[PDB]
Design an enzyme around this catalytic site. Structure first.
Site, PDB file in Angstrom:
ATOM      1  N   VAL A  26       0.816  -1.207   0.000  1.00 14.07           N
ATOM      2  CA  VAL A  26       0.000   0.000   0.000  1.00 14.07           C
ATOM      3  C   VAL A  26       0.854   1.264   0.000  1.00 14.07           C
ATOM      4  O   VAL A  26       0.538   2.232  -0.693  1.00 14.07           O
ATOM      5  CB  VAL A  26      -1.013   0.028   1.175  1.00 14.07           C
ATOM      6  CG1 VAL A  26      -2.075  -1.047   0.982  1.00 14.07           C
ATOM      7  CG2 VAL A  26      -0.311  -0.167   2.496  1.00 14.07           C
ATOM      8  N   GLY A  27       1.948   1.247   0.755  1.00  9.91           N
ATOM      9  CA  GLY A  27       2.813   2.413   0.803  1.00  9.91           C
ATOM     10  C   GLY A  27       3.854   2.399   1.905  1.00  9.91           C
ATOM     11  O   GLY A  27       4.063   1.387   2.572  1.00  9.91           O
ATOM     12  N   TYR A  31       9.760   4.536   7.890  1.00 12.19           N
ATOM     13  CA  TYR A  31      10.834   3.607   8.259  1.00 12.19           C
ATOM     14  C   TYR A  31      10.328   2.162   8.204  1.00 12.19           C
ATOM     15  O   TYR A  31      10.685   1.328   9.044  1.00 12.19           O
ATOM     16  CB  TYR A  31      11.392   3.925   9.657  1.00 12.19           C
ATOM     17  CG  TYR A  31      11.721   5.386   9.901  1.00 12.19           C
ATOM     18  CD1 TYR A  31      11.539   5.955  11.163  1.00 12.19           C
ATOM     19  CD2 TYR A  31      12.204   6.204   8.876  1.00 12.19           C
ATOM     20  CE1 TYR A  31      11.825   7.300  11.400  1.00 12.19           C
ATOM     21  CE2 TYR A  31      12.493   7.552   9.101  1.00 12.19           C
ATOM     22  CZ  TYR A  31      12.302   8.092  10.366  1.00 12.19           C
ATOM     23  OH  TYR A  31      12.580   9.421  10.597  1.00 12.19           O
ATOM     24  N   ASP A 164       2.167   6.608  13.786  1.00 11.67           N
ATOM     25  CA  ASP A 164       3.533   7.138  13.843  1.00 11.67           C
ATOM     26  C   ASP A 164       3.827   8.085  15.010  1.00 11.67           C
ATOM     27  O   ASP A 164       4.699   8.941  14.896  1.00 11.67           O
ATOM     28  CB  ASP A 164       3.886   7.837  12.521  1.00 11.67           C
ATOM     29  CG  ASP A 164       3.882   6.889  11.320  1.00 11.67           C
ATOM     30  OD1 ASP A 164       3.837   5.649  11.506  1.00 11.67           O
ATOM     31  OD2 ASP A 164       3.921   7.394  10.175  1.00 11.67           O
TER      32      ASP A 164
HETATM   33  C1  LIG Z   1      -2.698   5.598   5.566  1.00 13.25           C
HETATM   34  C2  LIG Z   1      -3.010   4.543   4.492  1.00 13.25           C
HETATM   35  C3  LIG Z   1      -3.457   5.037   3.271  1.00 13.25           C
HETATM   36  C4  LIG Z   1      -3.932   4.164   2.304  1.00 13.25           C
HETATM   37  C5  LIG Z   1      -3.966   2.767   2.522  1.00 13.25           C
HETATM   38  C6  LIG Z   1      -4.500   1.870   1.428  1.00 13.25           C
HETATM   39  O1  LIG Z   1      -4.849   0.715   1.697  1.00 13.25           O
HETATM   40  N1  LIG Z   1      -4.614   2.363   0.175  1.00 13.25           N
HETATM   41  C7  LIG Z   1      -3.786   1.910  -0.962  1.00 13.25           C
HETATM   42  C8  LIG Z   1      -2.631   2.890  -1.240  1.00 13.25           C
HETATM   43  O2  LIG Z   1      -3.025   4.230  -0.946  1.00 13.25           O
HETATM   44  C9  LIG Z   1      -3.507   2.283   3.742  1.00 13.25           C
HETATM   45  C10 LIG Z   1      -3.028   3.141   4.729  1.00 13.25           C
HETATM   46  N2  LIG Z   1      -2.565   2.577   5.971  1.00 13.25           N
HETATM   47  C11 LIG Z   1      -1.084   2.592   6.245  1.00 13.25           C
HETATM   48  N3  LIG Z   1      -0.597   2.113   7.341  1.00 13.25           N
HETATM   49  C12 LIG Z   1      -1.335   1.592   8.273  1.00 13.25           C
HETATM   50  O3  LIG Z   1      -0.707   1.122   9.390  1.00 13.25           O
HETATM   51  C13 LIG Z   1       0.775   0.972   9.454  1.00 13.25           C
HETATM   52  C14 LIG Z   1       1.048   0.106  10.664  1.00 13.25           C
HETATM   53  C15 LIG Z   1       1.286   0.706  11.897  1.00 13.25           C
HETATM   54  C16 LIG Z   1       1.490  -0.077  13.021  1.00 13.25           C
HETATM   55  C17 LIG Z   1       1.453  -1.470  12.913  1.00 13.25           C
HETATM   56  F1  LIG Z   1       1.622  -2.214  14.010  1.00 13.25           F
HETATM   57  C18 LIG Z   1       1.230  -2.076  11.683  1.00 13.25           C
HETATM   58  C19 LIG Z   1       1.032  -1.291  10.561  1.00 13.25           C
HETATM   59  F2  LIG Z   1       0.802  -1.867   9.366  1.00 13.25           F
HETATM   60  C20 LIG Z   1      -2.716   1.500   8.177  1.00 13.25           C
HETATM   61 CL1  LIG Z   1      -3.668   0.810   9.432  1.00 13.25          CL
HETATM   62  C21 LIG Z   1      -3.400   2.031   6.926  1.00 13.25           C
HETATM   63  O4  LIG Z   1      -4.650   1.955   6.825  1.00 13.25           O
END
Ligand SMILES: Cc1ccc(C(=O)NCCO)cc1-n1cnc(OCc2ccc(F)cc2F)c(Cl)c1=O
Ligand SMILES: Fc1ccc(-c2c[nH]nc2-c2ccncc2)cc1
Length: 337
Positions: A26-27, A31, A164
């Site tokens: 997803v992105g 880090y 974060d």
């Molecule tokens: C901020 C965002 C935008 C779009 C998409 C998405 O699915 N769209 C596709 C590309 O834009 C996903 C996200 N997105 C990114 N990170 C997330 O969590 C990171 C994260 C943190 C702590 C952990 F312990 C485990 C994790 F993994 C979530 Cl929970 C999320 O929801």
């Protein structure tokens, strides 16, 4: 130990338990690499983050520990927490990768602002959620320090979680005292950020789009005025006072005029969050009680966090020691069930 399966996704190797299926990149999760996946055990869509080079240096090793400790501690509806933490390693000596998993949200605040006009009702709900999450984080003596739209995950139900914490230019949402390099800033640096975010959701444009630290400070002072006498008295740095006091003095603007047609209650709150002197800014707890959030506010449902031990932050350990501490934390993890 569950059965792991390996695969390659965008140059990165992913070795995860079979319970997690259909991984899809997803992105960047700050880090770390992030994949959306399906948790066959719970039936939930989750986000899995693989830490990048967790033990590359003492900085990385301590940061890895820090992130794991923070994520294991956070248990709040508006703060990213942990569903699971694992490593394909079967021993400490073999331990070299850390994977974290949380509920998938699917979008960030920016994905809701761009070419989209939110109603005042939506702004109330989104900012209410950020503040409820901040009250919790702040009660643990944790400061986010980098709150911005990209660190605010939002799902289809407009539910929001802060990601974060305690770890689209980042400078745009930074408190002025940080731009000044003050080392004794307080938790209201986060309130400043919320104020910048709220203003942006109401207007459709970045409140302070600075091109650098200098430009950022200048744009901020044009709205909130240059420092008054009481604030000037608190600046210890001779260099800082020379620069600030040499600037053409600017008065604090009206706000009611700057944000013309916005809900007057929103303008009032914005004034209280964006007060220049950080010692006079509203706290997260106080903000929740502001009239703007009347339809959402409930003192009995805005929890505080259990005490968080940050003493490790002052310790200087070897990489292997931070690694062992992190391994201990991975093993002692107890999921929500
Ligand atoms: C901020 C965002 C935008 C779009 C998409 C998405 O699915 N769209 C596709 C590309 O834009 C996903 C996200 N997105 C990114 N990170 C997330 O969590 C990171 C994260 C943190 C702590 C952990 F312990 C485990 C994790 F993994 C979530 Cl929970 C999320 O929801
Ligand atoms: F141009 C300035 C001067 C002062 C601040 C400031 C805002 N809150 N607290 C401080 C501050 C900065 C340095 N020492 C003490 C307090 C920000 C920008």
């Amino acid at each position: 130990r569950p059965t792991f399966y390996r695969q390659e996704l965008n140059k990165t190797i992913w070795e995860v338990p079979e319970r997690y299926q259909n991984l899809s990149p997803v992105g960047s999760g700050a880090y770390g690499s992030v994949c959306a996946a399906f948790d066959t055990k719970t039936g939930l869509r989750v986000a899995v983050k693989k830490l990048s080079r967790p033990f590359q240096s003492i900085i990385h090793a301590k940061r890895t520990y820090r992130e794991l400790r923070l994520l294991k501690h956070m248990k709040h509806e508006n703060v990213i927490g942990l569903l699971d933490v694992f490593t394909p390693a079967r021993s400490l000596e073999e331990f070299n990768d850390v994977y974290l998993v949380t509920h998938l949200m699917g979008a960030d605040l920016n994905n809701i602002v761009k070419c989209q006009k939110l109603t005042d009702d939506h702004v109330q709900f989104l900012i209410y959620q950020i503040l409820r999450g901040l009250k919790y984080i702040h009660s643990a003596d944790i400061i986010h320090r980098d709150l911005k739209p990209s660190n605010l995950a939002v799902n289809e139900d407009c539910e929001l979680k802060i990601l974060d914490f305690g770890l689209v230019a980042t400078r745009w949402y930074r408190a002025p005292e940080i731009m000044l390099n003050w080392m004794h800033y307080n938790q209201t640096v986060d309130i400043w950020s919320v104020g910048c975010i709220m203003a942006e959701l109401l207007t459709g444009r970045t409140l302070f789009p600075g091109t650098d630290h200098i430009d950022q400070l200048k744009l901020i002072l044009r709205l909130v005025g240059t420092p008054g006498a009481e604030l000037l008295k608190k600046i210890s740095s001779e260099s800082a006072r020379n620069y600030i006091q040499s600037l053409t003095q600017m008065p604090k603007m009206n706000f009611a005029n700057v944000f013309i047609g916005a809900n007057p209650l929103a303008v009032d709150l914005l004034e209280k969050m964006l007060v220049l002197d950080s010692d006079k800014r509203i706290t997260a707890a106080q903000a929740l009680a502001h009239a703007y959030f009347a339809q959402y506010h409930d003192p009995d449902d805005e929890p505080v966090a259990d005490p968080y031990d940050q003493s490790f932050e002052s310790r200087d350990l070897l990489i292997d020691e931070w690694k062992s501490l992190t391994y201990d934390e991975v093993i002692s993890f107890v999921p929500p069930p």
